[PDB]
Design a binder for these strands. Structure first.
Lengths: 124, 116, 283, 283, 124, 283
DNA sequence: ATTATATTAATATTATATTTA
């Protein structure tokens, strides 16, 4: 249940936030306050203010991972998502506001799986 | 009793353990979730005068049930046992009577698929 | 009693805050789902006018409809024990009580109120009837979530000493709500809507965004008010094109709008000079 | 009770730090997404005024609304057990308790508070109602990420070596937040907002950026405060043009702004001398 | 999914940072802390302070590569990106702040490919 | 507990090295992007003061907040098992633990710390709150890249020849970081910030650049420290002009600055003699 | 005219010379 060729800005924005949250959760299991507990409150409205710090903290989160190939796969899927994201908009429309959370939870479901992300990464 | 059986199977909703609502809800108690406060302000032409006829003869449920249950669900700010079962019965009877195409009939338990 | 038809084009925006917020959706203003244009109900403008009258009058024959503790049944019973207590044969007694309330109340004279509770006294059709506002540019919802360093009830208080109750306080960056409204004369002749009441209503509509303010609404102002004063009680031209003559669109090569320097209110009063007038009160 | 209308143009900036952070965005100040102008909520100024009153008063009849150790339900129950315990017939009892709290509390007298918890006592509309601030020049976010040589919790993130917990501490180089606000008189006559309370509120707004300081907010100061004192309780001219007369734009050929030597506060008090006054307290 | 003719400052800045990170990663596979783990935290805000040291370290990173033609291709794409970069700004706007990461991940995706960068270099 | 307000103008520069370096940018100090003025966070000065206290005290009732081997949760649990173990009803128990930690710790008494981990014990607002430093002349970054003739980890460069690991070690030629800071009294009365602690903090701020040194920061010194001692807890004049009276600009016809012989610290104490004092500790 | 209240998943994308009267 995930459309990677929707060419929607909200879809790819939500998928990017979802993989960012997944990376932060994988960086440390004993995490109290994640990014979703603070960054998601304005991610669908002011993405250019939160996604900047998100991309700034992404490499450190990837380096914090115990496995280096996992970070490679996560960056690969990040870029496969952002392929359709030609630019970070100022503010999302209501339809895009909903598509944000849609793609967010869709990408979260696609990531929290047994054999799916690695299977898609193998065909690249 | 085939009409009553179909009406109560279409009204069969999910119920938890030790629930005060019975397995089959009374018709005045069911309409009480659609009235203003007490079961007396219902419309005596399309509610307490037509829903009983549609249930006791397995007829088609009117859209007035949809609209009243919607108004009382987003008005009372809660969906207790009575309004959701009525909407499920309406949807099932509309699917069975051709008044509903793209959707499908609902079951007792939670439908984790549906794709609606 | 007035005799002319007025088709005012009320224009008002919002700097930063929640103007007409929707109880249906938490604390966000009414916005168009398919597009994104902000919507403002007319009851907000009516309450602003009522507050302006309450703060700029304090006299009889112009009741302002009290707040909270003002039970409508009590006010109806108080207005019933006047000139038509019982000796009026119910039927025309209701009309007499309605006329007395119209001559005494200003909210029911300009707009209307429900007077069909216990002691029924008819209902007022209402002359001036505003409509729901709607912006042009698809506005965006900012959602400015803020916190509080003091809990309300002790039950929801944390098990520690840090008693906080956050929540959200929605805000709007811009959105010229192109309001609409029409004024009739037949109902105004029955309710007693004189020209002085019309001028008071115009002054209220002009200067209601300067006193009625709060923290949730923030700062709101009225742009312009182009009233289309007719000549008779008949219908000359459809009001659709009349209200479409004062179009409000985008300016140059800009994506959104922030203030009045980004809008171009195209006002071309050319074909409305047949049997109609034009005046500017707010703009 | 005050009788004049005050339209103050509060102007304040920030040297280096995070002023009004977070509309739920981590730790960044509220900025305009479409443009880049910084935004500051009025609750920050209200809390600064409350802290100034708490540190420059310590007396009765001017409650300051205590911090974390202050349950609102407990304070409401304590204020209820005074003159109107039960012998007041609920309805007017709520109004009496509201008037007592207005005469006792200063935060509810100047602004307002929620008193509709368990033991309801009505609500205060509030006379002085500030708005959300907004800068003119599109500010930029510096994001000064700093570290710490001491871990907090004993989780798995605490390595055997350097127990470090970095994070980010956002900063702002400049941004004159052009704040706005209006003061009414009808609600001030009910809440008891006298002229002494108004002068105390002005002094607090002037000298709140000298005591209320922290490491996250850094150094903040108030530029000027041009209060537009009216003559009556009516509406003379729309406040939009009144607040637009004191425009703040860029100076000469410069890209951004760093201090007061780069802004040109154009103050041309020419058309506001009809039935209004002007005073300077901060600038 | 990459626009090389957008004429946006954030786009080309992000693409330049992306190719810099790619060059640093290609210089040594056993890299622990890359530039993205330190330089990206202020690359979209203070580019004139990080991109100077970036351009200073770029020739040494290119010389560290085992293949000299790879460094030539990387410099070629660096200059093709910087064509639209008429000047290094002091601070990027919010829209430019988002376009920074947009172009960064777009160029990273375009670089981590089979036949794409070499194909574009052949037509020059 | 202190009762006067202190507005110190801390001035300090750097001979050759990296003072307050930025993790957000590799290893370069915080500099202004639009201009070029160097910026130094207050946490560096706070850590220097902490190190000075750790090396010039070694006693109880003045905890110094230990370095790497100091879990905050462990210290909080150790401070909880004292006088208020459980018999204090959580609410005021947190305040009692906070007061005990303020009377025991010096860092939380002068500045503050987070004590809201597992066993919550409230939070300290903090009296003395320093700000972020900022220079006047646009400094330049030297970037002194140096090498090493010994590899660290078995990476891909430690082949056959000289196992080398170069890198960069940034340096700064000059830059008088005009630091700022304000001291309150209301929070000092609650945290127990006496005058002896204030004198110790002044001595630390004066003599912290003589012991806390390293190879990356090089040689740093404190120029002057002009403390503006007030007379009461109220607000006399805005601190903006107070801190602007001690301006630091360029001297004669010079492009940059290298030492103290190129700066002209204009100190004209003329209008600050109303109800304020002046003292010189570092300069 | 209630219910319920404890953790999914994690191991490497890529990588070979523009231009030089």
């Amino acid at each position: 249940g995930l459309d990677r060729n929707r060419q929607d800005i909200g879809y790819v924005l939500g998928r990017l936030f979802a993989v960012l949250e997944k990376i932060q959760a994988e960086a440390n299991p004993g995490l109290n306050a994640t990014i979703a507990d603070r960054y998601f409150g304005s991610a669908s409205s002011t993405p250019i203010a939160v996604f900047g710090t998100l991309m700034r903290l992404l490499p450190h989160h990837l380096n914090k991972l115990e496995f280096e190939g996992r970070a490679v796969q996560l960056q690969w899927e990040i870029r496969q998502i952002l392929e359709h994201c030609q630019r970070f908009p100022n503010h999302l429309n209501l339809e895009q506001q909903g598509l944000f959370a849609i793609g967010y939870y869709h990408e979260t479901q696609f990531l929290f799986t047994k054999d799916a992300l690695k299977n898609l990464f193998n065909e690249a | 009793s085939e009409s009553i059986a179909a009406w109560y199977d279409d009204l069969q909703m999910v119920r938890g353990e030790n629930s005060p609502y019975p397995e089959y809800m009374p018709l005045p108690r069911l309409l009480g979730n659609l009235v203003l406060d007490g079961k007396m302000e219902n419309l005596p032409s399309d509610l307490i005068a037509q829903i009983t006829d549609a249930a006791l003869n397995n007829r088609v449920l009117p859209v007035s049930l949809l609209q009243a249950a919607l108004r009382r669900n987003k008005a009372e700010q809660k969906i207790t046992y009575g309004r959701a079962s009525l909407l499920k019965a309406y949807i099932n009877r509309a699917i069975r009577a051709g008044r509903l195409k793209n959707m499908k009939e609902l079951t007792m338990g939670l439908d984790r698929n549906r794709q609606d | 009693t007035i005799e002319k038809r007025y088709d005012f084009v009320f224009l008002f925006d919002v700097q930063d805050g929640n103007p007409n917020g929707d109880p249906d959706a938490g604390n966000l203003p009414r916005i168009d789902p398919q597009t994104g244009e902000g919507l403002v109900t007319d009851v907000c403008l009516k309450r602003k006018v009522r507050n302006f009258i309450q703060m700029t009058q304090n006299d009889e024959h112009h009741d302002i409809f009290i707040r909270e503790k003002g039970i409508l049944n009590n006010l109806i019973d108080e207005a019933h024990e006047q000139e038509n207590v019982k000796g009026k044969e119910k039927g025309e007694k209701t009309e007499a009580a309605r006329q007395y309330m119209c001559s005494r109340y200003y909210d029911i004279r300009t707009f209307g109120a429900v007077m069909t509770t216990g002691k029924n006294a008819g209902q007022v059709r209402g002359p001036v009837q505003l409509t729901f506002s709607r912006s042009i540019d698809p506005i965006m919802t900012l959602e400015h979530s803020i916190t509080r360093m003091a809990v309300t009830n002790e039950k929801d208080a944390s098990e520690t000493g840090d008693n906080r109750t956050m929540g959200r306080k929605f805000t709007v960056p811009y959105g010229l709500y192109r309001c609409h409204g029409f004024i009739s004369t037949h109902f105004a002749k029955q309710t007693g809507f004189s020209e002085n009441d019309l001028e008071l209503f115009w002054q209220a509509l002009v200067n209601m965004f300067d006193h009625d303010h709060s923290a949730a609404r923030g700062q709101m102002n009225a742009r312009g008010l182009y009233v289309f004063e007719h000549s008779n009680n008949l219908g000359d031209a459809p009001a659709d094109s009349l209200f479409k003559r004062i179009q409000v669109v985008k300016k140059d090569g800009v994506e959104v709008v922030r203030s009045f320097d980004d809008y171009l209110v195209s006002v071309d009063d050319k074909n409305l000079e047949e049997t109609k007038l034009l005046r500017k009160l707010g703009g």
